[PDB]
Amino acid sequence: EFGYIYRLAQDYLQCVLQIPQPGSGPSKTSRVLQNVAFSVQKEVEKNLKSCLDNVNVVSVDTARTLFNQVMEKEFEDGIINWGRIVTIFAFEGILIKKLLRQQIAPDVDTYKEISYFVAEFIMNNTGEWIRQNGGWENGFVKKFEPK
Numbered sequence: 001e002f003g004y005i006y007r008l009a010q011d012y013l014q015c016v017l018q019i020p021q022p023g024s025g026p027s028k029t030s031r032v033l034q035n036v037a038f039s040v041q042k043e044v045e046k047n048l049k050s051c052l053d054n055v056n057v058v059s060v061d062t063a064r065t066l067f068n069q070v071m072e073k074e075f076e077d078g079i080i081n082w083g084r085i086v087t088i089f090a091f092e093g094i095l096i097k098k099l100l101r102q103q104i105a106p107d108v109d110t111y112k113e114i115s116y117f118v119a120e121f122i123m124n125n126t127g128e129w130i131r132q133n134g135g136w137e138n139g140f141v142k143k144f145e146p147k
Ligand SMILES: *CCC(=O)N(c1ccc(O[C@@H]2CC[C@@H](N)C2)cc1)[C@@H](C)c1ccc(C(F)(F)F)c(C#N)c1
Pocket: 048, 050, 051, 052, 053, 054, 055, 057, 066, 067, 069, 070, 073, 074, 091, 094, 095, 098
């Protein structure tokens, strides 16, 4: 459900921003996701450096527009797979790093807005495929957890 996906998206943004939230800590799914998505994010940052250096992410609306353009390109052939879902989180990590650095009126309460639209996209466009492929615990974690 939305709340579950929003918590994954929020946890990943907090991981990239170096602000882990105090308390019981991230779930097993979140821990596995942070590891795989961060690895994909680092690869994307290097491989698409010229492409990422040409944008100025001055606002949440600018980040939303950029994210939608990436999603149209990522899923243009209509196929969904777990590697593509991990790539969504990798792009939200890149967007929050650019927003911290380039946002016009830096607003600490706008990192949750990026997490929100990423969760809306995941739920609306990939949610049914995720559920049919086992959800996060029986699908995602089984595929990507350490061997
Ligand atoms: C380089 C083209 C470009 O400026 N661009 C863009 C980046 C990435 C894709 O598609 C991904 C790579 C190929 C597929 N696997 C998906 C498409 C277009 C823009 C729209 C862009 C630049 C920078 C960012 C950044 F992350 F830095 F904020 C985004 C985003 N989000 C998009």
